[PDB]
Amino acid sequence: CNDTSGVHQKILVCIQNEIAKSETQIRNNISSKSIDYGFPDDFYSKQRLAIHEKCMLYINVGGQRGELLMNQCELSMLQGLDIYIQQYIEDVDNS
Amino acid sequence: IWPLGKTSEKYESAGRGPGVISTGNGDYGGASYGCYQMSSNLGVVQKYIQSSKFKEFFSGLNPATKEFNVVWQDIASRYPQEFREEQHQFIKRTHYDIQIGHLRGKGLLFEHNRAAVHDLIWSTSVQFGGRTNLIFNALNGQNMESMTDKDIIILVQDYKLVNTERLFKSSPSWWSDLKKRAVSEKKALLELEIDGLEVD
């Protein structure tokens, strides 16, 4: 990701690899929690779908630019969600 | 002589053959197809298939599945030359041809075949959309009667550079890449304009 040289597809691949990593961080952290912490089975997949629908608004922005922003949105939202799930887990632990 | 879209070629198609497929990483990564890597995520490849001579080959088949990829690569094997050209024409029809029109609707005409300014239009339409206002906005309030191809190219590429942070507010880790590209295309379009070549 230091040799994209503005090649659009290479930028998307970089973003997409980060998205997949973050999805996997989130999904595995939820997985690793006892029936205790109260995560519904379908919590990840519902929040992930809602994030997708949010970022899919960028289908209404033209060209490479709209596609880049769509993927960047997916990433920033997942990053937000990862931090939130961590913080929640902490708030349950801190109780 | 000069092939329309060659200046931005390396950012868009990057030497890829008509049969290249990438499977996007992630739950919603989808897949991207052909020379230009048209994605299934934003409906582009689906539109291409609807417009293609090979439309019916894909009957019943959804993009980002092995079946669809089998058929895509079969076609690229057995009709390499026609597939590549049909792909290129589709990018032309959905970005460049549309921007030429959109600009006409703002009172900006380009009824000639000089290569540099047409590469600019192609490039911009691909990067910002067939209906982008970028060129119009960069030329806003200049005298088109007495403006040179060189001036047009300078105004547009400086606009791109200088509005990068605003147009890509959401993606700051790419600003460096994007700004360089604007600078680099400017150089290449300026060289192309001096060689004074012809397209279409």
Swiss-Prot record, chain A:
Claim: RNA-binding is one of the keywords in the record: no
Keywords, alphabetical: Disulfide bond, Signal
Gene for this chain: tsiV3
Statement: the UniProt record of this protein carries the keyword Disulfide bond: yes
Outcome (variant: R65A): Greatly reduces VgrG3 binding affinity
Protein name (database record): Antitoxin protein TsiV3
Phylogenetic placement of the source organism: Bacteria, Pseudomonadati, Pseudomonadota, Gammaproteobacteria, Vibrionales
Disruption phenotype annotation: Deletion mutant is susceptible to killing by V52 strain in a VgrG3-dependent manner.
Any GO MF annotation of the entry: identical protein binding
Disulphides: C1-C14, C55-C73
Function text: Immunity protein that plays a role in preventing early activation of toxin VgrG3.
Complex formation: Homodimer; dimerization is critical for inhibitory activity. Forms a heterotetramer with VgrG3 composed of one TsiV3 homodimer and two VgrG3 molecules.
Swiss-Prot record, chain B:
Full-protein interval shown: 816 to 1015 of 1017
Segments passing through the bilayer: none
Catalytic residues (UniProt): D27
Disruption phenotype: Mutants are unable to secrete TseL.
Recorded superkingdom: Bacteria
GN (gene name): vgrG3
Stated name of the protein: Type VI secretion system spike protein VgrG3
Family statement drawn from the similarity comment of this UniProt entry: Belongs to the VgrG protein family.
Cellular location(s): Secreted
Species of origin: Vibrio cholerae serotype O1 (strain ATCC 39315 / El Tor Inaba N16961)
Quaternary structure annotation from Swiss-Prot or TrEMBL: Interacts with TsiV3. Interacts with TseL.
Function: Part of the type VI secretion system specialized secretion system, which delivers several virulence factors in both prokaryotic and eukaryotic cells during infection. Forms the spike at the tip of the elongating tube formed by haemolysin co-regulated protein Hcp. Allows the delivery of the TseL antibacterial toxin to target cells where it exerts its toxicity. Additionally, acts directly as an effector and targets the cell wall peptidoglycan layer of prey cells for degradation via its C-terminus. Toxicity is counteracted by a cognate immunity protein TsiV3.
